Amino acid sequence: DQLTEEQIAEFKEAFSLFDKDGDGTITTKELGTVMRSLGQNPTEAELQDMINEVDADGNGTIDFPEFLTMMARKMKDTDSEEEIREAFRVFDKDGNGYISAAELRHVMTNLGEKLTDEEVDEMIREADIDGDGQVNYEEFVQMMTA
Amino acid sequence: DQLTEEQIAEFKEAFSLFDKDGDGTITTKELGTVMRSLGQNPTEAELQDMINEVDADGNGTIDFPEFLTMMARKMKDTDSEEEIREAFRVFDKDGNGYISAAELRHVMTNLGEKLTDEEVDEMIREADIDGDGQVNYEEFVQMMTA
Amino acid sequence: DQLTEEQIAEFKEAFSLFDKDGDGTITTKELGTVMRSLGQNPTEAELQDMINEVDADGNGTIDFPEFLTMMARKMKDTDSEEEIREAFRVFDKDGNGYISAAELRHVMTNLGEKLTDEEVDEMIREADIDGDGQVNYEEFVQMMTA
Amino acid sequence: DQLTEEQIAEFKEAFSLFDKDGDGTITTKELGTVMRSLGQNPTEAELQDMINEVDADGNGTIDFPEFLTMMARKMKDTDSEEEIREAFRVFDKDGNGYISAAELRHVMTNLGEKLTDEEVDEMIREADIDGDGQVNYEEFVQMMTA
Amino acid sequence: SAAHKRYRRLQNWVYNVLERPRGWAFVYHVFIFLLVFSCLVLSVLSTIQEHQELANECLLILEFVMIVVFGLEYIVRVWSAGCCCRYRGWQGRFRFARKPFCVIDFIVFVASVAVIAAGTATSALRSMRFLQILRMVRMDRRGGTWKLLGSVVYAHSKELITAWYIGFLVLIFASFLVYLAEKDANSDFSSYADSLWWGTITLTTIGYGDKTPHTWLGRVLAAGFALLGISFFALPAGILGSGFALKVQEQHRQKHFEKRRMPAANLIQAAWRLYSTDMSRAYLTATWYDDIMPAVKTVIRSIRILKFLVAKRKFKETLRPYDVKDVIEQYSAGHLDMLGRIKSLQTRVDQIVG
Amino acid sequence: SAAHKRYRRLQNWVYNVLERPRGWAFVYHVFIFLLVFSCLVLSVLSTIQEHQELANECLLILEFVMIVVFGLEYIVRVWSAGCCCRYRGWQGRFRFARKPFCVIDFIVFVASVAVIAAGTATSALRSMRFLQILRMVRMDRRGGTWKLLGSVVYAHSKELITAWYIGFLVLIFASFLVYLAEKDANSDFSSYADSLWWGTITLTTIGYGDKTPHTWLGRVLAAGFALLGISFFALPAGILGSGFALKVQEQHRQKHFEKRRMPAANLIQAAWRLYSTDMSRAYLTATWYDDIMPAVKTVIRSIRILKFLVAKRKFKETLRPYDVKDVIEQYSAGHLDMLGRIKSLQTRVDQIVG
Amino acid sequence: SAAHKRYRRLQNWVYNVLERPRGWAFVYHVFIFLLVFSCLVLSVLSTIQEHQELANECLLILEFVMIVVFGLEYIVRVWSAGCCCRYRGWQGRFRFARKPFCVIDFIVFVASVAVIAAGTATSALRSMRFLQILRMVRMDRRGGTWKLLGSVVYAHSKELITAWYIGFLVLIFASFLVYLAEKDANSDFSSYADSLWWGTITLTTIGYGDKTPHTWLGRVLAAGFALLGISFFALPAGILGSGFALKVQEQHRQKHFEKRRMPAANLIQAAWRLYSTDMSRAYLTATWYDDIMPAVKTVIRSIRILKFLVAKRKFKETLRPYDVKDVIEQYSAGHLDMLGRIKSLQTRVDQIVG
Amino acid sequence: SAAHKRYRRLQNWVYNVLERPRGWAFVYHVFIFLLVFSCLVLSVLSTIQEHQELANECLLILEFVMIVVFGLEYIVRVWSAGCCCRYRGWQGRFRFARKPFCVIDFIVFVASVAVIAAGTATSALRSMRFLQILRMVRMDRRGGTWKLLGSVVYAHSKELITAWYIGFLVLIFASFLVYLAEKDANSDFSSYADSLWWGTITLTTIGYGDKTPHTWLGRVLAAGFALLGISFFALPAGILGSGFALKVQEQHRQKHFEKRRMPAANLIQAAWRLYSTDMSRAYLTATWYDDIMPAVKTVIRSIRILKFLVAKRKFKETLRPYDVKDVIEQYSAGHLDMLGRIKSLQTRVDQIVG
Ligand SMILES: O=C1N(c2ccccc2)c2ccccc2C1(Cc1ccncc1)Cc1ccncc1
Ligand SMILES: [K+]
Ligand SMILES: [K+]
Ligand SMILES: [K+]
């Protein structure tokens, strides 16, 4: 999946929605302004955490090379596949790489940034559930890392 | 003490005082409303704990089968006899199955949901107190579990 | 020092200043009222602690037999001599039964219910201080327990 | 560097700016008044700590002999050389007696009573920095203790 | 029934000294153990040839006294069981004898008496003396010792296995190396198995002296491998010892907390209040005399049953241990309640003055 | 694909019992250890001369059974690997066999079969029996034992070194002193090296009996130096034992906390939300049908990627341990928030009334 | 009485170096211990036959020096007792000698002198030398060692009993099994008692070499049961060691708290204030000169007695240890006081503005 | 002075690898220790008679290589000392050689060379080989090992003394009792001293086999007293082991806190600010050019000296450990500040509205 030049131009056009002034950088102001226009309400500390994940210069900005790297990579990297698989394993006590559909539903809608019923319905539909009702989450992780 | 059909009908008539709408369920609203009409003042968390002790479906209700089971059983089960006997043993340091009348009186009127003087007077009258003033609480437990 | 009958009558006359009603008992009301008339200001919890030290019946009162016992005994008992001597030993690191005049002065005026300068001056005058400036506190304890 | 009599007279003239009344002592009032006239704002607890460092009599004052001793000594004593060198060693993990110019800059401007940029610029200029960018702080300590 | 009072009190006393005695009551238990241990030692010494006569002399008397004392104690205990209400009348007595260890004792006693009677296959009647040791194993109520040891062993399984594994490897290696060196000069190390016997008897620090290295190369190798592996063969004792000590200390730590308290006291109260619904003078009034609206009293009873069940649960839960994060939880509760109080002030100031 | 369901389920079951055994799965592993160990002991006893015949008799049968069982298990495991998706098709199978320990096993099996075949340099074919022990060393997944031992040894290095150092000094000194005393009377202590051999074999508490002091001066010196240094030569075991026990307890202390929780659950959610940006029915509407303003959806995806990366980090961090200073931190946060609340009241009172 | 000052100071100094010494004072005690121990060793060596002469030679001189030194020290200590006020005048001196260990010493000294005098039943006069060891047992003030050991043993009784029980069982079993195997080939294992002797001497790791297994079956059985039970026979040392270490650490933890403080200081103050009621210049005024209303001063004294008794109790309580739940208690007190403060604000706002 | 840069950097590097080795620097140190150990063992083996020739053969070469290497290292280190400023010029070099261990090394080297030269009282020149062990003792910088051992021993003195005391008593008693039993039958126990030798060699678990009980009474007594006292003679190892482990853990606990921090950073700042009073461009202005009112700048310097002295003290204090009662102290400070804030609100409400 070599990154092509047209794909780079489409990332550039998204990057320019944040950096409307043409300064080549995205700060918490530019990021948070676009987000709130869509009806999101991040906090300042959440905007700083987000920028810090890709800001190698440590000056509180995202530049286009950092933006392009994040967009090209998504979740395809091996670190993402391993950590997501480690998160499922927290809820796999048997150690057999399986989790019950009903147990997945409980964790997704009752912990963390809970999924809505419709979100979790789409998630269980997308996993090829076995007839017992058990989900092989390691093949679920490869579908999100492909 | 086979549960008879007339006994079931009397439980049903009590159950219907809670569930006046005929919905077949008792929630915190129905339970707490009957209780406060008698001048009791449970909290919401106390009403939830009470319903949770018999709510197998986990949906916050008591249905008639659960109500009937609780009413038929009272304290006659072996779990109740053992736990009540374990509670007395907390206050039996000798380990001989005895507790002093005066020590029972102190614990009943000074700890927990304290008994009034008249309540504790009736309780000590009902235990066949020995001439020393010592109470054999394991036969006291069988009278409450009979 | 056999307790004589005239000594008993003088204790009775003091006891009657507290128990002005002739009820034969001293409660926190009677004790605290006499104390505040002299310009003292004990708290309620301090009045309860004081009465509790001599109230064997545990009903929150001092009767004349308890009052007479306390007055006849003062500090002459062996428990008092031992505990006072143990308190000095807290400040005797050498373990030789000595404490410096200057160290006694620091502890008396800087810890606890501090002595005034004049109080502590009288206390150091009363101990037969050695020429070095060291106090043999075990003979100081016998003078207060004699 | 024998302390001369003219040097003593110059210390006396500084001492008299604090002790304008001629009482021969510097309290928190005299010390703090001169300091605030120059635009400093010490707290009372900071003025007590400062006086306590040189007040052998423990009465909360500085007299001229104590003032003269502090002024004659500055940082030239062996205790000062050792403790300053121990402070650098906190930030020398290699144990080789070196610290990076950039690491010195981070510690000086980000911890404690942070140096301004201009202060820390003068400090790094004064250390004979090596071509790598590493500072031999033990010879830096001898220049401040000379 | 005053005399009946005294009877029941005595019964309970003896049952306590036998069943679950504490303090001074243990004096009788210590005496029984000494009588059994002496019987054992006498039997063992009887095994010798030179001392057979005097051994049997003393054994006859001791075994007779033992049979009489244990028969008497069995009868007295099966009687004393009468105190507790569970075993009343011959019905309850027999129910008692159904216990496993009680039947074990009865079997042992009958067997001992049968042996002595047959005294008047003598070797088998002898060999059957080892049964006495059951009277010692029985003192362990519900195999407490085995369970404790098993728990502590399982908790540390990883370290124990590591020690045994590394030690076994060092043993194999050192045995081989020493065998290579002493193979010819010394006759002890004739084959590899001999070298292994030496290695075990050496590394364990038993040191019989059966076989020892004679050539200086062997001696240097043995010194090295000893001062290296003797510690491996001695770890299990140290690991298990520290495990036991830490467990004891930590347990003794929980007792100081005394957290369970209040729940046991409340359970008895909810049980009494439920029970008294059906017998209290509070319900023996014209008002309560049930004929027109029976459900009212039934509803009141249903509420007391629900509260009883809440109290029984809270009581069972107290046994479970609690974390040290409670302080954070009380600060969270305290802060939240106070922050809500400042809000209620703020809203009222904004309501009146605006 | 129901039958395919059953196939895959069985495959996963066997792979679990082999690769990650738990509970009853460990029973099969214990049997394999019993087989390897019996083969080893039989070989060793075969080394003896008097028992060579019966040893080889039993060894033939046992070795044949061993070869068959281990070949079968190897084939079954390399098949069962099919469950996990990583190794699918012969491509994935071969990728599996690339593992180090799998190739080690295959080598050992082929070698054993070649030995038995050559059975029909016999001494070398014998000596090659020691290879079986690899089937035991392989049970240690990733040298866990060695790593644990190394960690605990390194943490205590200072005390161990102190013990060994002082012990060595005491040994040198006591050996010299005793040699001085027994030099002439006793023939054992002919030279200094002999005295050193004695000193080691005594201070370690092995005590062969090879050499012992004969003159009373030597005996008093040995008693003194023993009751002084025997404790030094036994410290390492005690130190390491307490170290292991404390480490186990403290670890078991971390498990109660269950601090990591929430982060793992949120990571799966941020990953699902990011993934569903490109397939959800939420984006299959006329509104989203991309042609006029593609960047809007790209910007929405870029935000979900950033949140996913925040959740992955918070999830990875949970593994790291946390200090007990959190309570101070919550008080600092709680006090600061409340002090700021009283300020906001004060400013509003001063605004309205002044 | 300046010279009397110096006299009393010297007296107190010597009494301190005798009754309870610190630092350099312990040097004298070490010298006394060396003297007693040398006397003991000389006596033991005198027991031998070949060394009787030189032994008695040295023993005469050493025993004479010992008698003189200990007589002198006894006299000096019974004099130095004069420092403390309890024992003043011959009355108090005799009261002193009533102590148990003082009379024990006097008896031992008189007996030693009588023995030496009789020197000019010689075997009994010899045997009476063992009495010196009392001069060592006396150093233990109030059997501190025995009490410490007893406490720590009782606290761990369960684990100790488990270890001894399981070890005894393993010993019985392994001894029986090995006896079965070596019964015929080896002559050592003639009877069961011999096998038991072997089992003990092995499992304890003493390993005399008296009896060892000769047949390979016996050797394998012994290796197994050893590598299984040697750890059981070595637990008590590990358990007790960890117990002692943990107890020491935890105690040293209590000292850092320094909780008792304030109570001891306040007790002296309440005692002085009570005492001064009857001698202070504050009461030597015309106002207080008692004739018209004696009860007023008596009432003031009664109040000081009650406060003294409160201070004595609070002082005795400080010795008792305190829990780590105090922080929860201070938060409860702090929250309650603050919540009551916001209520008092709320009521006043509602009073004025309404 | 670029080349001078490289020179000084190399100098510092070598001085670091020699004086304070860390990481890979220890590789050189291990080689030096291995070479020293090889020399000792060769000498010892030279002591034997049968191996004297080959021993001296190898010893000649090894000793020569040793002398050359250590001379070279001495010269290189005394040169490398040049890095630190303390020892510059021959003045500073000589100041360096004044160190104790440096002169010790020079003496040892000169002595070794003199011995080899005299090679061309030969027995004394031999005996002087033991000096090498100083090159091992020197590795302990400032007797760290001795100090650690002494601290841990002193902290536990009470338990150690109890163990030794009770063990000694049990030894005396058991020896006497066994002697009474074996006195006649067995020839080993000829006198009491023999019984004591046996008792020590048994209770310590050495077990030479020299003397063992032969009569069954003696065997039973020995079994009892062994299974009673062997644990006493093994306590010191367990106590000291747990002590060391606990100390290590608790220390490793203090490092996690990282409390000292901020003070060291502030000290450098106060020192720089004081120093810069006399050289900063901030004071090189017409305004500061001192002629009219010199005291103003002197007063400013006096203030910086006082602040420097406060920072030096706070820095020295950080080294001292801190208690876990700080949380109570922060609540006390936080509550007091907040309670004072509600008072300031209350007073202002009462001022305006009244
Ligand atoms: O840290 C501890 N506490 C504790 C900490 C924060 C708040 C409350 C309590 C605690 C309480 C009772 C006994 C022992 C402890 C320890 C250690 C300690 C340290 C200094 N002085 C006394 C003790 C160990 C511990 C750690 C982790 N889990 C359990 C125990
Ligand atoms: K041993
Ligand atoms: K041994
Ligand atoms: K031996």
Curated annotation (Swiss-Prot), chains A, B, C, D:
InterPro entries: CALM/Myosin/TropC-like, EF-hand-dom_pair, EF_Hand_1_Ca_BS, EF_hand_dom. Ubiquitination results in a strongly decreased activity. Phosphorylation results in a decreased activity. Ca(2+) 3 binds at D92, D94, N96, Y98, E103. Keywords: Acetylation, Calcium, Cytoplasm, Cytoskeleton, Disease variant, Isopeptide bond, Long QT syndrome, Metal-binding, Methylation, Phosphoprotein, Repeat, Ubl conjugation. There is a cross-link at K20 (Glycyl lysine isopeptide (Lys-Gly) (interchain with G-Cter in SUMO2)). One of its GO terms (biological process) is long-term synaptic potentiation. It is found in: Cytoplasm, Cytoskeleton, Spindle; Cytoplasm, Cytoskeleton, Spindle pole; Cytoplasm, Cytoskeleton, Microtubule organizing center, Centrosome. Ca(2+) 2 binds at D55, D57, N59, T61, E66. Residues 75-146 are annotated as: Necessary and sufficient for interaction with PCP4. Interacts with MYO1C, MYO5A and RRAD. Interacts with MYO10. Interacts with CEP97, CCP110, TTN/titin and SRY. Interacts with USP6; the interaction is calcium dependent. Interacts with CDK5RAP2. Interacts with SCN5A. Interacts with RYR1. Interacts with FCHO1. Interacts with MIP in a 1:2 stoichiometry; the interaction with the cytoplasmic domains from two MIP subunits promotes MIP water channel closure. Interacts with ORAI1; this may play a role in the regulation of ORAI1-mediated calcium transport. Interacts with IQCF1. Interacts with SYT7. This is Calmodulin-3. The lineage of its organism: Eukaryota, Metazoa, Chordata, Craniata, Vertebrata.
Curated annotation (Swiss-Prot), chains E, F, G, H:
GO terms for molecular function: potassium channel activity; voltage-gated potassium channel activity. Residues 46-56, 181-192, 215 are extracellular. Two molecules of phosphatidylinositol-4,5-bisphosphate (PIP2-I and PIP2-II) are essential to activate KCNQ4 channel by inducing the coupling of the voltage-sensing domain (VSD) and the pore-forming domain (PD). Upon channel activation, PIP2-I and PIP2-II disrupt the VSD-calmodulin/CALM interaction, causing the release of CALM from the VSD which triggers the opening of the gate. Calcium suppresses KCNQ4 channel current through calcium-bound CALM C-terminus. Therefore CALM acts as calcium sensor that controls channel activity. ML213 potentiates KCNQ4 channel. Changing R138G: No effect on inhibition by potassium channel toxin SsTX. A 1,2-diacyl-sn-glycero-3-phospho-(1D-myo-inositol-4,5-bisphosphate) 2 binds at R142, S157, H252, K255. The keyword Ion transport applies. Residues 193-214 dip into the membrane without crossing it. Expressed in the outer, but not the inner, sensory hair cells of the cochlea. Slightly expressed in heart, brain and skeletal muscle. It catalyses: K(+)(in) = K(+)(out). One of its GO terms (biological process) is inner ear morphogenesis. It is found in: Basal cell membrane. Changing H252A: Shifted activation curve of KCNQ4 toward positive potentials compared to wild-type. Decreased current density. Changing G207C: In DFNA2A; loss of potassium selectivity of the pore. Changing R22A: Shifted activation curve of KCNQ4 toward positive potentials compared to wild-type. No difference in current density. Residues 264-273, 301-315 are annotated as: Interaction with CALM. Changing D210G: Resistant to inhibition by potassium channel toxin SsTX. Normal voltage activation. Homotetramer. Interacts (via C-terminus) with calmodulin; forms a heterooctameric structure (with 4:4 KCNQ1:CALM stoichiometry); the interaction is calcium-independent, constitutive, participates in the proper assembly of a functional channel. The interaction with calcium-free CALM controls channel trafficking whereas interaction with calcium-bound CALM regulates channel gating. May form a functional heteromultimeric channel with KCNQ3. Interacts with HSP90AB1; promotes cell surface expression of KCNQ4. Each channel subunit contains six transmembrane segments (S1-S6) with S1-S4 forming one voltage sensing domain (VSD) and S5-S6 contributing to form one quarter of an interlocking pore-forming domain (PD). Mutagenesis experiments were carried out by expressing in Xenopus oocytes KCNQ4 mutants either individually (homomultimers) or in combination with wild-type KCNQ4 (mut/wt homomultimers) in a ratio of 1:1, to mimic the situation in a heterozygous DFNA2 patient. Belongs to the potassium channel family. KQT (TC 1.A.1.15) subfamily. Kv7.4/KCNQ4 sub-subfamily. This is Potassium voltage-gated channel subfamily KQT member 4. It comes from Homo sapiens. The gene is KCNQ4. The chain holds residues 74 to 588 of 695 of the full protein.
